[PDB]
């Protein structure tokens, strides 16, 4: 089964938080399961958001499994500076309009296609 999770972390109603990529761009938080998660997807999602962005989230919703990563969305209810020195060295998270965020996830192939699919699932109309 999938061994990684990720999150679409919203800033208010209309923007999405992103964290710096390794090519001077922007990505969504995602990562592998940790033993502390106990195999629980929601726990992994919340831990990833906390570790990569300093994000605390409200209720989360499952979006789907894209690129062998389990994706949720949630709205950020608290933001703090990340404590991991390696995360801090990448630099501050930022929030962007949904359109800008979609652009920042577009065209990167396997590096971000699942992130893009998660963003689109999170913002799909009904």
What report would you give on this structure?
- With about 130 residues, this protein is of the alpha+beta class.
- The protein has helices at about 40-55, 85-90, 100-105, 115-125; strands at about 5-10, 15-20, 25, 30, 55-65, 70-80, 95.
- It has a single domain (about 5-125), classed as Nucleoside Triphosphate Pyrophosphohydrolase (Alpha-Beta Complex), CATH 3.90.79.
- The chain has four helices and seven strands; from the N terminus they run ββββαββαβαα.
- The longest helix is centred in the middle third of the chain and has 13 residues, at about 40-55.
- It comes from Pyricularia oryzae (strain 70-15 / ATCC MYA-4617 / FGSC 8958).
The CATH class name reads Alpha Beta
Radius of gyration: 13 Å
Tell me the distance between the termini: 29 Å
Q: Per DSSP, what share of the residues sits in E-state strands of 2 or more residues?
A: 35-45%
Quaternary structure = monomer
Question: What is the helical fraction, as a range of percent?
Answer: 25-40%
PDB class: hydrolase
Keywords: Nudix hydrolase, Effector, Inositol pyrophosphate hydrolase, hydrolase
Assembly: monomeric
Entry title: Crystal structure of a Nudix hydrolase effector from Magnaporthe oryzae
């Amino acid at each position: 089964g999938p061994m990684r999770c990720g999150v679409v972390p919203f800033h208010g109603t209309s923007e999405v938080w992103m964290v710096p990529s390794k090519e001077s761009g922007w990505i969504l938080p995602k990562g592998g399961l940790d033993v502390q998660d106990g195999g629980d997807w929601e726990t992994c999602v919340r831990r990833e958001a906390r570790e990569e962005g300093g994000f605390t989230l409200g209720p989360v919703e499952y979006l789907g499994t894209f690129g062998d990563i389990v994706w949720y969305k949630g709205t950020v209810t608290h933001k703090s500076d990340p404590t991991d020195p390696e995360v801090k060295a990448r630099g501050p998270a930022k929030h962007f309009t949904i359109s800008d965020a979609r652009g920042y996830l577009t065209g990167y192939g396997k590096k971000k296609d699942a992130m893009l699919e998660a963003l689109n699932a999170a913002t799909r109309g009904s």
